[PDB]
Design an enzyme around this catalytic site. Sequence first.
Site, PDB file in Angstrom:
ATOM      1  CG  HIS A 176       0.666  68.277  27.443  1.00 25.31           C
ATOM      2  ND1 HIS A 176       0.991  69.612  27.833  1.00 25.31           N
ATOM      3  CD2 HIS A 176       2.160  68.547  27.810  1.00 25.31           C
ATOM      4  CE1 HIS A 176       2.279  70.315  28.101  1.00 25.31           C
ATOM      5  NE2 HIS A 176       3.149  69.565  27.413  1.00 25.31           N
TER       6      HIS A 176
ATOM      7  CG  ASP B 292      -1.775  70.948  28.751  1.00 25.04           C
ATOM      8  OD1 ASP B 292      -2.111  70.015  29.931  1.00 25.04           O
ATOM      9  OD2 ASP B 292      -1.213  71.718  28.208  1.00 25.04           O
TER      10      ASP B 292
ATOM     11  CB  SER C 187       6.261  70.863  28.625  1.00 20.91           C
ATOM     12  OG  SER C 187       5.112  70.968  28.578  1.00 20.91           O
TER      13      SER C 187
END
Lengths: 5, 5, 5, 5, 5, 5, 281, 281, 281, 281, 281, 281
Positions: free
Chosen positions: J37, J66, J133
């Site tokens: 993502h 992901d 992230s």
Amino acid sequence: XXXXW
Amino acid sequence: XXXXW
Amino acid sequence: XXXXW
Amino acid sequence: XXXXW
Amino acid sequence: XXXXW
Amino acid sequence: XXXXW
Amino acid sequence: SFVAAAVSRSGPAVVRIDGQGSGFIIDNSGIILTNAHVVDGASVVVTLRDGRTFDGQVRGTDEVTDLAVVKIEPQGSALPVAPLGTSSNLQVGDWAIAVGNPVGLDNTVTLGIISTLGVEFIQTDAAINPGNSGGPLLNARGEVIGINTAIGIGFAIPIDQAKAIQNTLAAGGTVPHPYIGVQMMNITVDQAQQNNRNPNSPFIIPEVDGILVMRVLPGTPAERAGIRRGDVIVAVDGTPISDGARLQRIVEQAGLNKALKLDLLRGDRRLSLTVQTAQLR
Amino acid sequence: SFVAAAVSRSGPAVVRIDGQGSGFIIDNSGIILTNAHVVDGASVVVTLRDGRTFDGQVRGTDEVTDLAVVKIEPQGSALPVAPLGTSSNLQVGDWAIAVGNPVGLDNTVTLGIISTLGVEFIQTDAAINPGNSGGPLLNARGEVIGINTAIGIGFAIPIDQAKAIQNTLAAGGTVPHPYIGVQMMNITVDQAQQNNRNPNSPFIIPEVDGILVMRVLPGTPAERAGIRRGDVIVAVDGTPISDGARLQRIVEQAGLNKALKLDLLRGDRRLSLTVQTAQLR
Amino acid sequence: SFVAAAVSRSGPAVVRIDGQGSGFIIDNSGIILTNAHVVDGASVVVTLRDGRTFDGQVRGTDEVTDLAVVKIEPQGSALPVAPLGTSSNLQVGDWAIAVGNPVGLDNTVTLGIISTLGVEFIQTDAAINPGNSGGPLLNARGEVIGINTAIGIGFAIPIDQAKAIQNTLAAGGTVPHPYIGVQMMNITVDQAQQNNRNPNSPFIIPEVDGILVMRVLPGTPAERAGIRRGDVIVAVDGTPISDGARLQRIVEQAGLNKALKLDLLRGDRRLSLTVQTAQLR
Amino acid sequence: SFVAAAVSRSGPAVVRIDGQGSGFIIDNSGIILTNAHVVDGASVVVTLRDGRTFDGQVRGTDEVTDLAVVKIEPQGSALPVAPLGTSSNLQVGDWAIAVGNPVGLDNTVTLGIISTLGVEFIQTDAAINPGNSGGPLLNARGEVIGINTAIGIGFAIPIDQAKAIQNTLAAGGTVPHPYIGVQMMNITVDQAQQNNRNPNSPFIIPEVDGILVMRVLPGTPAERAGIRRGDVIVAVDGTPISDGARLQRIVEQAGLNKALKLDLLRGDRRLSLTVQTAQLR
Amino acid sequence: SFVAAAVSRSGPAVVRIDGQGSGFIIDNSGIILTNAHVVDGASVVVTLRDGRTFDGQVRGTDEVTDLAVVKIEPQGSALPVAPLGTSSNLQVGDWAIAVGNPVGLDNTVTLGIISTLGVEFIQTDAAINPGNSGGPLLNARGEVIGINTAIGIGFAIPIDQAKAIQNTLAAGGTVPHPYIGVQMMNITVDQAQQNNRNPNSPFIIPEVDGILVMRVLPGTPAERAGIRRGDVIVAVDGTPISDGARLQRIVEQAGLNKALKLDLLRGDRRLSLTVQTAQLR
Amino acid sequence: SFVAAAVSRSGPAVVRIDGQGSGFIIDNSGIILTNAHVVDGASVVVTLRDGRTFDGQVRGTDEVTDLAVVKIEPQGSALPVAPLGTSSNLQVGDWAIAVGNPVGLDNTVTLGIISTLGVEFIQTDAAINPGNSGGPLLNARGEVIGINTAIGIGFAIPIDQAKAIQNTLAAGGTVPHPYIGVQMMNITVDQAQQNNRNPNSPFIIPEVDGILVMRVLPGTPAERAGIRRGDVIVAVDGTPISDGARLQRIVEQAGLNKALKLDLLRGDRRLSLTVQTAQLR
Ligand code: NA
Ligand code: NA
Ligand SMILES: [Zn+2]
Ligand SMILES: [Zn+2]
């Protein structure tokens, strides 16, 4: 960029 | 003015 | 009552 | 103060 | 349960 | 339909 | 816990300032550091951890650094003092202890690490809140390395920073913050000519890499020197710039009321103006 | 009530179309007018005031005028027909009766006046809602003078307007709506040079009075002809314009796929381009 | 439609004032009425229904009545004039026609009735909006009986009211609005001693029926005379009052800077003070 | 601080990927791990902590796990490499260090512990955000044990998980994720017959304990095999199930395009269908 | 990690209680502590970390302390037991480990420190949530020192507190919580006479320092004794008070149904009433 | 205005009832009609347009029709009486005048038309609000034809409806409203078998056209007779139904406590139950 002032 | 289109 | 002012 | 109760 | 898929 | 009741 | 020894060391010097907020005593004279935003312009009552309610006056304020120096009069028992450390040797990942005094009797204490380093600003995953804002941020040894500032990441004004303007805010509270009033942006040829191919961009940037004046702030040396939005300052002095951070520096290295010529182009026209640096307020 | 006689006259022709909405039967053949937005692209079931549920197909649609022509097959009792009036002689302040059929058995009826006149569009203080959208707007005599359009002032498409494109939407449903794709604005010297003295205006307008291209719409004849935001079309043809309404006209008077040259200046440069009119969709 | 004849009669005198709003011409001299809130303190451009753009100055304003008098210079064709009616004979249920000029070429017109009567204020179920605020409210014959005021019920300043302060706002724009600064309430023994039995009421009312001072407004003659919240003015002059509406009157009947003694009791103590009436601003 | 030594060890390998996000270099070849993502389908620019801006392509993506594998070309100085640990021996309560590179020069670092363990997913009270992230989650020794995933508890994809599909996403980016398209629920007799006594439950469950098909997802092998909402799959193969987690497993143990018979009852009728497993996308 | 050893020590005793929430087993008899708000008045199913689903009854509840005692019947393997510590020697800055069992198989574990100390209540920067509410808060050695209570700072009921009322809630569940029903506030002369100079304060405080009755709660011993809002209790017994915290104590030191005289003044009047302490519910 | 004559005729009988609301006097005895929701269960003070404040008691209430009968004692001047018309001959498009008395001295009056007709309920584009709720809705002649009910379209309870239950609510206030407690829906084969082909529909409808029980209301004769959601009542008596409106009728035609058998099928099973009609409350 930031600028600010 | 309007424009639109 | 109203008052106002 | 707190009160509570 | 979850399922998902 | 309505139902209601 | 190693933090208990740190809280025992600097904690008794952490005071309540009453809108609200915390502060900490810098020496036995009654010199207290806090956030400028803790002090709503007025000149407050200081409560120590032991319950002693002195009466403090605000001897200085730096709004743009957001830090004040409060004064209280030493009487009776010795005013507890928090030992100052230095923020110039901080490592990312070193323990960080945020101490506040939200009520004036206890110390609320949170624990984290140095989340990131700007020197310029300190980040920490130690919970920073209204309960400890103005209070000190300590290292594992219990010497203050920052000043908590509430606005899960928190911020702290480095302690070496406050050291610099201490005497000033102790005395006459005006710190030199030269400026011109231009919200700039870093522009890239590959952003510029890329802009210039979007039919709905505001203005075509004249190719190049640089600082794109994004806004001229009202009543500023940059408005007064005839600078417009969309302008591109190419060289100050003779120094080519494309950084919006770097320009902020050279302004400051120049004094207050210091004329700085500005080579800039307005679409096609080459244009040189001299702004004179004012004090940010 | 005079409105009762009007509702008795056109009301039985007002039908339900099922998202939802109203419509009204134009003649005994089964030709029904409604709003294009009543018909979500598909081709619906028509319920008359008497309960008869025919089955209708959508023979045409004009999205930009927002009106459709539905067809049903006459069988059994004669299809009731609403008498068409003419909107070219409407007076501001004449009674307006908005009739809908929200369920398919009754007629919901609201009363107002002609609130304002565009010919171009009708305004009314008669309550216009989803309950009567597509339904007719009548005069005091009960002949339709508009087509209610829901979005305390309501709007109605004039009836002379629908008359024009009836046969077309009755047959092949494509109405000529030439365009170029430019959101323009009326500019004034005293707005222009006034703009040009605001340091934070996007672009300096080249003085003058005119049509300031405010936006170029994606994938339009104006994007394809290289028109940019901030441009100022001074003369089309040789015809000086400063009206954003007036330009919309000359486009339409030109055909579809009709090359129109555009004298415009880009800040300083004089620039002439020819857009070719496409069909609004 | 009877309203068409009314709009034809007063409509050409209804002008646009440009924040925005409507107004209407009172005589051929160029005297125009509107709402004070249409005029944001400055002194605007007036567009007539025929397109003529005069230039107007604001010769007066009454903020508390919310109505201004604008002036334009008659030139060329005669300025159209709306005939003034009188609001002193209005009946609840008489037709009401709200005319505005939102663009400066057409007249937007809504129809309703006199919803209620204060003399003091007019209510109507005629749609009143920014599009017609400052514009006239007409009767069935087309003479103005009010001035629309936007804030389904709308309000209009009676026309007899504007007549009164016309010459004043035509000249030096200050209307006598005497006041003292007390938000009062009607109190009843059966509300008072009923209050006095709720353990969590702010203050015990000293029984009686009267005007309970609910609030003293900052920097007012009532603050300056030492009036407090919770006080109960029993008699002005010698005149017993229990009405908060009635007191507003006697103040006004007294001049500006007019000393009025106030017999009032503060819980138990009897207290008499004299406020001096100031001008509401 | 022990975390400083960990950040010093893996930190230089943590890069910025630019919507935004972090990643980390797996070996000197230029293989970088991140979140899928972080990569909006395209194939990005990688900035190392030292400022070196390489140019990266996205060689693989697993949407359902992901996580992506980006590639950059090693040139000049050796690409720093973060040492991979193993997540199969993680203890709940072990230190967790979340490192990101939000700007491309520093490393932002947060500290926490292993909050819970799924193998399947990692939870941590280390502050996980957009700033880190795709970046690595390290143990006390500074070897990566997870991949931070932003959505005070955060999540991390275990590192043993990414190891598995590394070569695949390094090459042709399609990971086997067999499925059938049924949102199931665990049902209990004491939930079932308890359901069956609520007069307003959707459908009566046929007693028993099991997996109650709560939903059939559009265009799935379960829709195509005629499975309905309210159905109860009792046995796959001959294997009785009442777990909605357990069924997810046996599907995966079967290949892609693998016919699986399903013994299920529809209220009263016994029903056996065979779904064929498709690839989740 | 030192926390791993703590979680290994008390973690197996931490159970799920099912609205939801956690709890922990106090001894092998099957005595479990949790939050009263975990138990919605009913008397739940207990799942141990090993998967064993016992069946528990709620033998007690203290709503005002928010803690319950649940009972399960020991069978088969020995019920794991969390070792109780003591909260009377807690230091601000000591490690705090919040353990919950949100599913009934794992333990979710967060780490923080003792953020502040009331004895009265515990604060911690350990993430406290629905996932661990009712669960234990441990020290570095793994003995419970609190009971997590969800509502970045969390709260925990001290363990010495629960020890006190354990046997009671184990048996007949009614804990003595004497009260009178008065929301009081600390008043200061320099707040009082300062209040008394604001014209819009509700009531004039009779100078002095004290406890200003801010509210009388409905159906309380204070309403029944005729206490009003705005009253000022000066002395109970003969003991002068200005603290709203201190008064809460002496009530409790007096029994239930214990007459306490109250010297208080109502504006001007001196007033002495005796409330009789009821049980908070 | 014709409405002025109508307001002059019925207006003096329109009273204030004080939560708030309006009402109107039915005869000189002091019988007043209003909305049941104007009367919050209690038994209010009535103010006439002339200022006379009588004291009224609530002699009846029908919650499901939302209308009450209040009583006042005639004394002094004759109580003004509003003349009752009949709602059985109302035409859609007839004038409608909504009169309220929001203060008790004036009458607020709005004008509209009969927007639609249920007999069952009246709709009007006359502005209906809290200011006139309970007040009368008049025709052009000034006789009441409805009772305004606030919740641009408003509703009014027909006057023939109130006539029916007048004497009852005048005396013992309980009106026969038989019911069974089933929220039904009209189902169509082409909705049913169309439902039955959506894999995610709650329950398969057994084909057919009918009344699909959508919900069984708690504590109703339908819950007590074992009716479930998803059931399909095919025939009552022997009378096939597919209308949810029609069934509401036959219930009412049957008494209170009247056993009605219900032929219905539950998916596959044929099922006949007898509900006994209760009183809606
Ligand atoms: Na009307
Ligand atoms: Na920590
Ligand atoms: Zn209306
Ligand atoms: Zn934390």
